[PDB]
Amino acid sequence: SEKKPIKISADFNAKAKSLGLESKFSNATKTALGDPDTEIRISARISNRINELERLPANLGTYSLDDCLEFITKDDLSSRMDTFKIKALVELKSLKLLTKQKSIRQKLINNVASQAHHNIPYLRDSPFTAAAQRSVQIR
Amino acid sequence: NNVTLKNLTAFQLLSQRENICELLNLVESTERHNSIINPERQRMSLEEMKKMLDALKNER
């Protein structure tokens, strides 16, 4: 507190940490979704939800409490009978198309990362990226 | 042992920050500065120089 708050030593991992740059020497960070245990758990939860959704009845109308103003005469069709059925179908199908969304997302991410050094200014303009792109084109 | 853009930028920024923090006297680097100087190693090297000089002096 009173004295120098840094106290650099000859470790370079405490020295780098004390000045802010700690994770900046590792390739990729540490995350939670990278373990098979959490993956199995998430898959279990998703399968349970899909099971519950599929065990619903097909005839799943909804009484909307605003049908009062629509003077239904036992022959007309209520304009809101399919509102919980539509939501159930939407959730079920969205849960069944998860891998497709994952694939499209990873395609987008890869095709936007591969062009980082060409589309992002502060990466394209550093002397090191420019030097590397020049070094590749040496005839 | 590998050098990527991230490593290079981190190294350069670390050097710059260390230098500036030293300008403001916000860092105490006695351990590094006395492991590089190593006054024990200084005395050892000085005595070795003296012995070698005496050896060269007495061979004549």
């Binding site: 507190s1 708050p5 | 300008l23 403001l24 006297n25 916000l26």
Partner: peptide, 16 residues
């Protein structure tokens, strides 16, 4: 907090 205190003390010692 105390970081600003230390930084400003260092700058004042540097400028004086």
């Amino acid at each position: 907090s105390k970081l600003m205190e230390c930084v400003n003390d260092a700058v004042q010692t540097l400028l004086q």
